[PDB]
Design a protein around this ligand. Structure first.
Ligand SMILES: N#C/C(=C\c1ccc(O)c(O)c1)C(N)=O
Length: 325
């Protein structure tokens, strides 16, 4: 399998563009930035609202938990490549504590409203608009040869007053190289594509479009997360209990993957459930024919059949957002 778009971006650029192991970091000044308050955390980082002591402007201090130096240069190299891209978080500086050489990444600050509080607030138009702003970031980073591999609401910062969106936490992002077999232990479980759950390792940018579809279904159906598996086997069962197992079988046969017998028995056999079966009084105002048609074209087993980010942006679901632009 091979990406249908942007497959050659890294082939044609000089090796220094994608050769992140060879990057040499020019370290800033650790004392330029002071922690104000903790803002977030994850397996690999703690994140703080900071202040730039020179201009007194806010910033984000991302202190990286101890990991292999490779993962560090990878995130830095990707952030440098994407800086200036539409709705990509801007890496401002890189610093380290002198005694322990623990590195910190400095970013612009987004006055985010956490999605668990923000999303139930959003109007139908607001959903269209913010998903459109996210699509801009994905099309750009795909066009620059990079897969984010961790799309989820936790990684989309939104200042709802300024209507500003940033795609954050590029610590799992990776360069796309046609034919390369990647680690399927990426993304967060509820947003892993089927390709990750059946150990199809030569995936591509289209993985991010499944994750986006999961996010989007969660928003319009107000079912968060939309596919709620307990572990990685269960997560595929939950998908197959919606898309149907017939579609799963042709996917597996087309890319010549056999499921593990334990996983195969767990999936069983299920007919496809139409998207309207998730509508209720609460989400009804958000579930129009165009939203459904758009969601249907993201959540396909076959990663080659899903919309690209560029195609998604032209879907008639977004026509009113494009017209405002
Ligand atoms: N949280 C948070 C925020 C920013 C951020 C920026 C880059 C990252 O890699 C990251 O994990 C977080 C924020 N509210 O602006």
């Amino acid at each position: 399998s091979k990406a249908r778009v942007y497959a050659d971006v890294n082939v044609l650029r000089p090796k220094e563009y994608w050769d992140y192991e060879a990057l040499t970091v020019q370290w800033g000044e650790q004392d330029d930035y002071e922690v104000v308050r903790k803002v977030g955390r994850g397996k690999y980082s703690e994140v703080f609202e900071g202040i730039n002591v020179n201009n007194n402007e806010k910033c984000i201090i991302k202190i990286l938990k101890p990991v292999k130096k490779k993962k560090i240069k990878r995130e830095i190299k990707i952030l440098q490549n994407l800086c200036g891209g539409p709705n990509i978080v801007k890496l401002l500086d890189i610093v380290r504590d002198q005694h322990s050489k623990t590195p910190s990444l400095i970013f612009e600050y987004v006055n985010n409203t956490d999605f668990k509080v923000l999303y139930p607030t959003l109007t139908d138009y607001d959903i269209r608009y913010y998903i459109y702003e996210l699509l801009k970031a994905l099309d750009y980073c795909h066009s620059q040869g990079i897969m984010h591999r961790d799309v989820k609401p936790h990684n989309v910062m939104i200042d709802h007053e300024l209507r500003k969106l940033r795609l954050i936490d590029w610590g799992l992002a990776e360069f796309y190289h046609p034919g390369k077999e990647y680690n399927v232990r990426v993304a967060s479980r509820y947003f892993k594509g089927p390709e990750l759950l059946v150990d199809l390792q030569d995936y591509d940018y289209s993985l991010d479009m499944w994750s986006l579809g999961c996010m989007f279904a969660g928003m319009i159906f107000r079912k968060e997360p939309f596919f709620y598996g307990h572990d990685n086997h269960d997560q595929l069962v939950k998908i197959a209990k919606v898309l149907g197992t017939d579609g799963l079988n042709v996917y597996l046969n087309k890319y010549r993957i056999e499921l593990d017998p334990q996983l195969e028995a767990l999936v069983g056999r299920h007919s496809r459930k139409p998207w309207l079966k998730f509508m209720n009084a609460d989400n009804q105002h958000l579930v129009s024919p165009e939203a459904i048609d758009f969601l249907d074209k993201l959540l396909r087993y076959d990663h080659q059949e899903r919309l690209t980010a560029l195609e998604a942006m032209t879907h008639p679901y977004f026509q009113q957002v494009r017209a405002a632009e």
